[PDB]
């Protein structure tokens, strides 16, 4: 037989919509135990504000996991630094947020949890707390000591991975080196196989310049670097199509035959993806020893505690992580 | 009110332009279709395609008449050499340029209400020894336009670009306050005068991801884009601040805007094309007159085949007609 799996969930910024969404997630049944790494009173209070029921059971590593039943959550306690008011940032709680991220990450690394699903966090308040922080991705990449991770955004079957992420537009070109493409594609191909269960992944690659450089008249990176690397990889047996113009690549004739698209940078790949799934969009981090998914939106402070939060993205992030667990177990 | 005339240039004679125009002709139109080309070229390409075609002479002294199915109105310009579909003939470069000049002058003089252009081949024109820096450039110069802004639109979305075909590494330094002021002024101006929108609402993309996230991801938004937009909003222009490109393309935004200004090519066209694709139409903003254009090349390998696909030519023409209707 199999064992009930546990997934760890970090609601994120206490004053944002993360806690609201996690209380909303809890209103249905799940085939895994949902271990929520947060402050008990925070969830209890927020649930009351939303008029939703919630009973918390303690994370108990020395007992078998049990599927999470509606109206409940399993809690791995982490104390808040200061009292919370929905919508208002409290600098000291920045340490609390990171503490939950660290504990959740470690549990995934120690094998306590089969996946990690993150709610939104406010980077500002974390830095104000004196903790350098540029996002979950960099945080997990570093704490997990992974050589490199790749960010991916996905809806149903349409998946876009990024060669570069949150960098100024002007720093992108010089970052596209043979070393980067080799690592990024290796990780993408690897995880599509190990985490997505795709035996022979087919990757669609964007050029860096409009028209993919149009034969060198619009940039030389495709001819100088991208093409040589892709062919080096195709000789290794990888199935790659491209580089292709970004404004041409997102078509059925190309997408129907690809398991993922690799964009050279953030705004080249995400706009199409987002305009294809308001909610439903899921941020996935590839290259880590464990499965990590996440909502694809912000903390929406102005909505915290008011009852009008869209749980669509968190639900899909959770569903996806659960489905990926099998491919690894 | 009164029937308007639009002028159409099929373009490179050996290309698919004539093919598309002959197909365009197979239906009725609410405007008179004045095609600036060689009569023989059109009748021959018609025969090759098995489509019927009757040409009536452009008669400026008579009232314009809506174009009837199976016909086109002709503004004659003679080929310099015989045409073979699919083969470029340098001598006909002079013919191509003459049709562009005549059509352009007609739009500047009030003879025609809009110009819809078929595909042209720059290489053959240049190889004939003819100074010519490009299709839209030709019109920009002949019309004495100071600056043009390229836009791609369908019916539910209009995307203008601050920069077009530049290597990605050249974009950042190209986004200057002067370029931005210029581009937005034209965009705001034309949404008024060419699309007939009284109080245009424009969504503006940041240059950097997350619109630079308070300077944590680039400084262009704080150093350049935000100041320019602030200045223009002070002029009543409805500009929705630099928004992250990956959140901007959404109803709470789009349904509230008449156009989106993207900073560069791959930031705005992928979504436009995904939301439409063949539905796309290129509109040149900044000229003294309305000009729309097909979105494909001369496709010489398809010329005279029968698999043309006048689809995009129809969308470009329909779009120009609507613009004429909403501005008269
Ligand atoms: Zn991002
Ligand atoms: Zn282009």
XYZ file of N, CA and C in Angstrom, chain A residues 123 134 158 165-170 172-174 207-211 217-219 221 245-248 250 255 265-268 270-272 274-278, chain B residues 157 164-169 171-173 206-211 213 216-220 244-247 249-250 254 264-267 269-271 273-275:
234
model
N 7.666 41.378 0.060
C 9.119 41.500 0.126
C 9.569 42.746 0.896
N 14.593 38.570 -1.913
C 14.164 38.997 -3.238
C 13.019 38.139 -3.773
N -0.231 24.311 -20.574
C 0.590 25.416 -21.063
C 1.506 25.779 -19.916
N 14.848 35.780 -14.721
C 13.630 36.183 -14.080
C 13.499 37.647 -13.713
N 13.652 37.958 -12.435
C 13.474 39.332 -12.009
C 14.717 40.191 -12.068
N 15.134 40.500 -13.297
C 16.306 41.331 -13.589
C 15.870 42.525 -14.451
N 16.623 43.635 -14.389
C 16.277 44.801 -15.203
C 16.322 44.330 -16.660
N 15.479 44.891 -17.518
C 15.514 44.475 -18.915
C 16.918 44.619 -19.481
N 17.605 45.701 -19.119
C 18.953 45.939 -19.648
C 20.037 44.939 -19.233
N 19.465 41.549 -19.212
C 19.147 40.263 -19.806
C 20.122 39.716 -20.853
N 20.445 40.520 -21.859
C 21.312 40.045 -22.924
C 22.617 39.450 -22.422
N 23.354 40.213 -21.629
C 24.622 39.712 -21.134
C 24.481 38.472 -20.253
N 13.513 32.854 -28.980
C 14.790 33.467 -29.255
C 14.849 34.612 -28.253
N 15.961 35.322 -28.217
C 16.100 36.453 -27.307
C 15.592 37.740 -27.932
N 15.858 37.905 -29.224
C 15.457 39.106 -29.952
C 14.157 38.926 -30.706
N 13.464 40.034 -31.014
C 12.209 39.896 -31.763
C 12.558 39.143 -33.061
N 11.608 38.382 -33.598
C 11.841 37.586 -34.800
C 13.016 36.607 -34.601
N 19.986 40.168 -38.412
C 19.764 41.590 -38.659
C 19.248 42.288 -37.410
N 18.668 41.495 -36.514
C 18.089 42.000 -35.272
C 18.697 41.383 -34.025
N 20.024 41.343 -33.947
C 20.663 40.750 -32.786
C 21.394 39.487 -33.197
N 22.592 37.130 -30.713
C 22.582 36.089 -29.682
C 22.071 34.713 -30.134
N 10.458 33.012 -32.899
C 10.015 34.368 -32.529
C 8.957 34.236 -31.440
N 9.043 35.040 -30.391
C 8.046 34.932 -29.324
C 6.627 35.232 -29.795
N 6.475 36.138 -30.749
C 5.129 36.465 -31.200
C 4.585 35.512 -32.260
N 5.285 34.400 -32.470
C 4.885 33.376 -33.435
C 4.771 31.999 -32.752
N 3.728 31.023 -29.723
C 2.518 30.658 -28.983
C 1.322 30.298 -29.879
N 2.706 24.673 -29.951
C 2.324 24.278 -28.592
C 1.756 22.866 -28.449
N 13.165 35.591 -21.110
C 12.980 36.518 -19.997
C 11.526 36.713 -19.591
N 11.359 37.180 -18.352
C 10.071 37.421 -17.677
C 8.885 37.939 -18.508
N 8.993 39.137 -19.073
C 7.869 39.679 -19.846
C 7.678 39.112 -21.248
N 8.595 38.257 -21.682
C 8.453 37.655 -23.000
C 7.544 36.441 -22.879
N 5.565 35.472 -19.639
C 4.408 35.492 -18.748
C 3.126 36.187 -19.204
N 3.228 37.290 -19.959
C 1.998 37.963 -20.403
C 1.012 37.036 -21.119
N 1.495 36.214 -22.042
C 0.583 35.302 -22.735
C -0.032 34.314 -21.744
N -0.491 34.541 -18.438
C -1.459 35.217 -17.576
C -2.763 35.538 -18.315
N -2.655 35.864 -19.598
C -3.834 36.133 -20.420
C -4.167 34.757 -20.982
N -4.660 33.883 -20.121
C -4.993 32.519 -20.509
C -5.481 31.853 -19.235
N -5.303 32.554 -18.117
C -5.739 32.033 -16.835
C -5.671 33.066 -15.726
N -6.736 33.855 -15.567
C -6.764 34.858 -14.508
C -6.214 34.226 -13.242
N -8.670 44.624 -28.852
C -7.419 45.079 -28.265
C -6.465 45.798 -29.223
N 10.289 49.154 -31.902
C 9.902 48.018 -32.716
C 10.974 46.975 -32.960
N 11.541 46.963 -34.154
C 12.528 45.938 -34.445
C 13.971 46.265 -34.097
N 14.264 46.209 -32.802
C 15.595 46.480 -32.267
C 16.043 45.245 -31.489
N 17.354 44.994 -31.446
C 17.858 43.838 -30.703
C 17.449 44.113 -29.269
N 17.117 43.072 -28.518
C 16.706 43.254 -27.131
C 17.703 44.070 -26.318
N 18.999 43.888 -26.562
C 19.983 44.643 -25.778
C 20.000 46.168 -26.008
N 17.064 48.097 -26.312
C 15.818 48.712 -25.842
C 15.874 49.721 -24.681
N 16.541 49.343 -23.596
C 16.624 50.187 -22.409
C 17.090 51.618 -22.674
N 18.210 51.776 -23.371
C 18.735 53.108 -23.663
C 17.895 53.858 -24.671
N 5.389 48.890 -17.984
C 6.656 49.368 -17.472
C 7.696 48.736 -18.399
N 8.926 49.235 -18.380
C 9.994 48.685 -19.205
C 10.510 47.399 -18.568
N 10.643 47.426 -17.249
C 11.165 46.286 -16.499
C 10.089 45.382 -15.930
N 10.452 44.137 -15.582
C 9.436 43.242 -15.023
C 8.880 43.883 -13.759
N 7.591 43.665 -13.496
C 6.931 44.254 -12.329
C 7.069 45.772 -12.370
N 7.208 46.320 -13.576
C 7.380 47.761 -13.743
C 8.512 48.278 -12.850
N 9.418 47.348 -9.948
C 9.160 47.149 -8.520
C 9.887 48.163 -7.624
N 13.630 48.243 -7.557
C 14.366 47.035 -7.193
C 14.686 46.190 -8.417
N 14.062 46.530 -9.537
C 14.251 45.796 -10.784
C 14.468 46.726 -11.961
N 15.316 47.727 -11.780
C 15.573 48.673 -12.847
C 15.092 50.032 -12.409
N 15.701 51.084 -12.939
C 15.330 52.435 -12.538
C 14.588 53.256 -13.589
N 14.459 52.720 -14.794
C 13.788 53.444 -15.869
C 12.393 53.949 -15.500
N 2.844 46.289 -14.518
C 3.652 45.137 -14.917
C 2.970 44.550 -16.145
N 3.756 44.201 -17.160
C 3.171 43.656 -18.376
C 2.378 42.375 -18.147
N 2.766 41.586 -17.150
C 2.059 40.331 -16.914
C 0.799 40.416 -16.054
N 0.385 41.624 -15.699
C -0.849 41.782 -14.932
C -1.739 42.729 -15.711
N -2.470 42.955 -18.994
C -3.383 42.354 -19.951
C -4.528 41.571 -19.290
N -5.398 42.292 -18.578
C -6.548 41.710 -17.883
C -7.736 42.682 -17.866
N -7.877 46.111 -19.307
C -8.233 46.175 -20.720
C -9.642 46.714 -20.952
N 8.328 47.552 -25.846
C 9.062 46.907 -26.915
C 8.272 45.757 -27.552
N 8.752 45.330 -28.717
C 8.149 44.289 -29.552
C 7.585 43.036 -28.845
N 8.442 42.236 -28.215
C 7.973 41.007 -27.581
C 7.203 41.165 -26.256
N 7.021 42.403 -25.802
C 6.283 42.658 -24.574
C 4.800 42.809 -24.891
N 3.284 42.232 -28.541
C 2.740 41.471 -29.656
C 2.342 40.035 -29.339
N 3.120 39.324 -28.498
C 2.712 37.948 -28.209
C 1.265 37.835 -27.709
N 0.877 38.676 -26.755
C -0.493 38.631 -26.235
C -1.501 39.034 -27.306
N -1.314 38.830 -30.504
C -1.462 37.722 -31.438
C -2.168 36.501 -30.850
N -1.958 36.237 -29.566
C -2.592 35.088 -28.926
C -4.084 35.332 -28.767
N -4.448 36.591 -28.518
C -5.841 36.993 -28.341
C -6.528 37.092 -29.697
